């Protein structure tokens, strides 16, 4: 149970915006210009790390 | 363990809608008379194809700044819940038209939410919205008990007691209406000349939606790793048939991890499963390089 | 042509587990999904509304608050629509919904609604309002009130959209609000974007042709939604069959915290 | 062995061990 | 700065405020205040703007 | 002391304050709070808590 | 001593600015506007986390 619960918690963390405008990376890439797209992906990257 | 193997998508298919109705942006964009900042007019836009290249092609807009969307990426996305607002403000007040900006027109005339997404436009209107004797047709709410809510209009013309002297039905000392007319004149320089501001309030989600760009529709394929676009959602996954019973009002489907696993194409009402293409880690088995080089 | 003909009595009963609808338009199967939205509380203290017309103004309009749950066991022809707005007069926009024999005529104009509005049966709207101008919306679709059988409706006015939810659930001869779960399915949406704080229910009346209207009685129930967090259970086929209100009692709070419907012995 | 006289019912060695081992708490609360 | 005594002093022909709303003066904290007093005819009161 | 206005705990949190209107010392005490725990047997056995 | 010092250090960490202008949440809420106030609380919450 501990193993499965840890894995499920890890998967769930991808659905969190984590200070960004969208929690899905593809939408961020397709909606926004590179200079601020980098800011959004930096929030996502540091949170996921 | 060296790397991870993953099959790349063979080709790209883009799926869009099929209704054809040029979107009436021209009605907003050459409106001869514009609403006041306190009496702003909002117009809804739906069931249209929106081309924003024409906006760039002919453009007198000095300030064209978008907060949630890239202006060059506008044609590649699908929107819904789309509204066009209309008002005229001062030249120095264009900065106040932004989320979380403190200003008299911000607090009492037009509030923008902190999480606002869309494009705000601003351009001079000295030729049309200014008069040599003074264009007073535009009024602003200078006094109000509390700050307005985002996307809220205040029309009530309750004569305001601007002091400790009651009006008693007679406007006068310390009693002026909350609406004051702008003294727009062509002689004034930049920062005080009338400016025309229009905000586009596209609400972008991960859904079929209604409004869509000029992108053409392509045919669908099955049982092949393809990168696909469905009303602005870009993904890489195989497309297979569905046995899931989708509800009519329902369009998208999500699994335990809240991930799209079934989609109902807007152009053709069928349910297609999303399964990402096969991938796995690669491990290399080798003896010592001194003994041999086979792997 | 505004006439006062409806006198009304009120009671109070228990809501049980009625009033659950679909929060969104996504298909989920065999999951436990927790959502925060405007729902009717479980075992809430609903008002039983009994309007009787016999062949003065005794039918005041009801506040809207954050939304209204409507239920009725009457036949289709009896209840024939609702009225929404803030001041119910011509100075503000008003929304009118009127069902009929063929379909519905949802229409948002500036109505000068009557004190006691009712549809008199052809069908005439003169008893509903005296005037209608500056009309900014209209929508006609298939009727949502069609033929013992419970009819349940939920309305919200969220961020400019006038949501509607409906469902039909046949019942036996017991308490009209029954046990079990019957989720409301969403059927019509409304791009209106107006301010509503007060609503009234419409009733069909038949001309006596012999006391110009035939006597009739209509029983309906009025609840009010509140911001509540629910844990809905989607079955194998994507239908909601159970829900737990996280803010009703400590046991429900633990059920909501553990994201499960069964709690093992222990202290949580 | 336990001491009947002491209310805590502790042996003298246990009593010595207890004594020899000891608004911060409110601030942490 | 107690502006209430200013408000309640006497009936005023004009209490026009430029750049600041009269109500927020009490809750707004200023560095320096300059009071300029002079006597002019009524027709020229509008010229002081 | 006459100059001192606020008092602080060991862990650098305010525990006392001096009223400006009237020169007295007041002990600031937090409002009561705690963790709510629910004791229950199995839901299959019973529903009392 | 280890446990007491750990609690003391944890409580003490609240008084540090953590890259923001102020260590008081009420101060940053009262002085500054929701966007940049949001930036400051983002700094505070990530540091306290
Ligand atoms: C039920 O409602 C429909 C729709 O309002 C009615 O049909 C309308 O009749 C008018 C005649 O004045 C036409 O102008 C409309 O175009 C019709 N609407 C539609 C959608 O066809 C119908 O008469 C009503 N039935 C009853 C018994 O009242
Ligand atoms: C065109 O689109 C509408 C709705 O988007 C759909 O109902 C209709 O079947 C489509 N027609 C064709 C020929 O694809
Ligand atoms: C429901 O509310 C009414 C009045 O608001 C009250 O008289 C009645 O006792 C309530 N019923 C319950 C079960 O609380
Ligand atoms: C509402 O109607 C009245 C009279 O019919 C008209 O004077 C007024 O301009 C209208 N208002 C709007 C917003 O259309
Ligand atoms: C809706 O109207 C009521 C009464 O007219 C008013 O109190 C309320 O503020 C209005 N809604 C909004 C969002 O201003
Ligand atoms: C779900 O659908 C299947 C197939 O139609 C049916 O056999 C079953 O009774 C339905 N309900 C449940 C709870 O499985």
Per the listing, tokens 């609604």 go with C113
Q: Which two tokens stand for residue F34?
A: 């705690």
Q: How many C-beta atoms surround the C-beta of residue C88 within 10 A?
A: 22
Centre of ligand 6 to C-alpha C237, Å, is 6
Cβ contacts of B157 on chain C, cutoff 8 Å: none
| 3-state helix/strand/coil string of C209-251 | CCCCECCEEEEEEEEECEEEEEEEEECCCCCEEEEEECCCCHH
Q: Which two tokens stand for residue B294?
A: 């086979």
Centre of ligand 4 to C-alpha C109, Å, is 11
∠ CA C15-C19-C20 to the nearest 5 degrees? 135
Type and span of the H or E element at B128? helix B126-129
Nearest CA to ligand 5 atom 12: C195
Q: Is C235 in the pocket of ligand 6 (CB under 6 A)?
A: yes
Question: What contacts F10, CB < 8 A, 6 or more positions away?
Answer: D23, D24, D27, G8
Centre of ligand 5 to C-alpha C194, Å, is 10
Collapsing DSSP to helix, strand or coil, G26 comes out as helix
**Chains touching chain A, criterion 3+ CB pairs below 8 Å:** B
Q: What CA dihedral angle connects B95, B101, B102 and B106, to 10 degrees?
A: 80
Per the listing, tokens 């005037």 go with C131
Q: Give B253's strand partners.
A: B262, C27
Residue C166 CA from chain centroid, whole number = 8
- Nearest C-alpha of chain A: how many angstroms from B254? 12
∠ CA C185-C181-C187 to the nearest 5 degrees? 5
Tell me which residues of chain B have a C-beta less than 8 Å from any C-beta of chain C.
Answer: 42, 44, 46, 151, 207, 244-247, 249-254, 256, 262
**Rounded Cα–Cα distance for residues B44 and B151 (Å):** 13
Q: Which two tokens stand for residue C48?
A: 């039983």
Residue in chain B nearest E5 by alpha carbon:
B164
Cβ contacts of B266 on chain C, cutoff 8 Å: none
C263: nearest CB among F36, F37, F43: F43
Contact B7, B57 (CB under 8 A): no
**Rounded Cα–Cα distance for residues B99 and G39 (Å):** 14
Nearest CA to ligand 3 atom 6: C12
Half-sphere exposure of G39 (CA within 13 A, CB side): 8
Q: Is D21 on the interface with G (CB under 8 A)?
A: no
Residue F41 CA from chain centroid, whole number = 33
Type and span of the H or E element at G6? helix G2-12
**Rounded Cα–Cα distance for residues A7 and B118 (Å):** 37
Pocket of ligand 5 (CB under 6 A): B 149, 152; C 86, 195, 197
DSSP labels, B148-211: PPBT--------B--SSS--TT--BTTBB-SEEE--B-TTS-TTTS-EEEEEE--B--SS--SB
Q: Which two tokens stand for residue C54?
A: 């016999």
**In chain C, where do the E strands start and end?**
7-14, 26-27, 31-39, 45-53, 62-63, 68-72, 79-85, 94-98, 104-113, 119-120, 129-141, 149-158, 161-170, 185-188, 198-205, 216-224, 226-234, 240-245, 266-267
| 3-state helix/strand/coil string of B237-252 | EEEECCCCCCCCCCCE
Cβ contacts of E13 on chain B, cutoff 8 Å: 173
Question: What contacts C247, CB < 8 A, 6 or more positions away?
Answer: C228, C229, C253
Half-sphere exposure of F11 (CA within 13 A, CB side): 18
Contact C118, C128 (CB under 8 A): yes
**Rounded Cα–Cα distance for residues C23 and C64 (Å):** 20
Q: How was this structure determined?
A: cryo-EM
Q: Are strands C94-98 and C119-120 parallel, antiparallel or unpaired?
A: unpaired
Secondary structure letter of residue E44 according to DSSP: G
Structural Rg of chain B based on CA atoms: 27
Cβ contacts of C87 on chain B, cutoff 8 Å: none
Q: Which two tokens stand for residue B152?
A: 């809220």
**Rounded Cα–Cα distance for residues B286 and B288 (Å):** 7
Collapsing DSSP to helix, strand or coil, B274 comes out as strand
∠ CA C129-C131-C134 to the nearest 5 degrees? 120
Residue in chain F nearest D26 by alpha carbon:
F9
**Rounded Cα–Cα distance for residues E9 and E37 (Å):** 15
**Rounded Cα–Cα distance for residues F32 and G46 (Å):** 27
Cβ contacts of D24 on chain G, cutoff 8 Å: 4, 8
Question: What contacts B118, CB < 8 A, 6 or more positions away?
Answer: B66, B67, B68, B69, B199, B200, B201, B202
Residue to test with chain F: of D26, D28, D29, most F Cβ within 10 A: D26
Q: Is C134 in the pocket of ligand 4 (CB under 6 A)?
A: yes
- Nearest C-alpha of chain B: how many angstroms from C27? 4
């Amino acid at each position: 149970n501990h193993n499965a619960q840890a894995l499920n918690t890890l998967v769930k963390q991808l659905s969190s915006k984590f200070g960004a405008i969208s929690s899905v990376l593809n939408d961020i890439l397709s909606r926004l210009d590179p200079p601020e797209a980098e800011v959004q992906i930096d929030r996502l990257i540091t949170g996921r790390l | 363990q060296t790397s991870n193997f993953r099959v790349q998508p063979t080709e790209s298919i883009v799926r869009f809608p099929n209704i054809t109705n040029l979107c009436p942006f021209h009605e907003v964009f050459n409106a001869t008379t514009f609403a006041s900042v306190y009496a702003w007019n909002r117009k809804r836009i739906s069931n249209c194809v929106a081309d924003y290249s024409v906006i760039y092609n002919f453009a007198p807009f000095f300030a064209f700044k978008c907060y949630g969307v890239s202006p060059t990426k506008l044609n590649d996305l699908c929107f819904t819940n789309v509204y066009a607002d209309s008002f005229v403000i001062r030249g120095n007040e264009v900065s106040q038209i932004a989320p979380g900006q403190t200003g008299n027109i911000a607090d009492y005339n037009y509030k923008l939410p902190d999480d606002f997404t869309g494009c705000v436009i601003a351009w001079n209107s000295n030729k049309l919205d200014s008069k040599p004797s003074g264009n007073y047709n535009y009024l602003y709410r200078l006094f109000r008990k509390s700050k307005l809510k985002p996307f809220e209009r205040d029309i009530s013309t309750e004569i305001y007691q601007a002091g400790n002297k009651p009006c008693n039905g007679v406007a006068g000392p310390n009693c002026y209406s909350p609406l004051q007319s702008y003294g727009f004149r062509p002689t004034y320089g930049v920062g005080h000349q009338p400016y025309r501001v229009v905000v586009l309030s596209f609400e972008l989600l991960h859904a079929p939606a209604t409004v869509c760009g000029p992108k053409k529709s392509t045919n669908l394929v099955k049982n092949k790793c393809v990168n696909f676009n469905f009303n602005g959602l870009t993904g890489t996954g195989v497309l297979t048939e569905s046995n899931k019973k989708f509800l009519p009002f329902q369009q998208f489907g999500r699994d335990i991890a809240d991930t799209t696993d079934a989609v109902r194409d807007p152009q053709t009402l069928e349910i297609l499963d999303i399964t990402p293409c096969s991938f796995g880690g690669v491990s290399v088995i080798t003896p010592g390089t001194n003994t041999s080089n086979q792997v | 042509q505004c006439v006062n003909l409806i006198t009304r009595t009120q009671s109070y009963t228990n809501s049980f587990t009625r009033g659950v609808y679909y929060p969104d338009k996504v298909f989920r199967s065999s999951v436990l999904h927790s959502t925060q939205d405007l729902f009717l509380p479980f075992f809430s203290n609903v008002t039983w509304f009994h309007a009787i017309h016999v062949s003065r103004f005794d039918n005041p309009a009801l506040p809207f608050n954050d939304g209204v749950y409507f239920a009725s066991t009457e036949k289709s022809n009896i209840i024939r629509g609702w009225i929404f707005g803030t001041t119910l007069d011509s100075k503000t926009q008003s929304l009118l919904i009127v069902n009929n024999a063929t379909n519905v005529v949802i229409k948002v104009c500036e109505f000068q609604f009557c004190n006691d509005p009712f549809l008199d049966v052809m069908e005439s709207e003169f008893r509903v309002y005296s005037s209608a101008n500056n009309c900014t919306f209209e929508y006609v679709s298939q009727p949502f009130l069609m033929d013992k059988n419970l009819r349940e409706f939920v309305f919200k006015n969220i961020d400019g959209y006038f949501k509607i939810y409906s469902k039909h659930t046949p019942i036996n001869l017991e308490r009209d609000l029954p046990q079990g779960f019957s989720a409301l399915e969403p059927l019509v949406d409304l791009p209106i974007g107006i301010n509503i704080t007060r609503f009234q229910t419409l009733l069909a009346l038949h001309r006596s042709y012999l006391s110009g209207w035939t006597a009739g009685a209509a029983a309906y129930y009025v609840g009010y939604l509140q911001p509540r967090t629910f844990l809905l259970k989607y079955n194998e086929n994507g239908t909601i069959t159970d829900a737990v209100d996280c803010a009703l009692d400590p046991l429900s709070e633990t059920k909501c915290t553990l994201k499960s419907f069964t709690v093992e012995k222990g202290i949580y | 062995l336990p001491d009947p006289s002491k209310p805590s019912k502790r042996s003298p060695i246990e009593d010595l061990l207890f004594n020899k081992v000891t608004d911060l708490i409110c601030a942490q609360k």
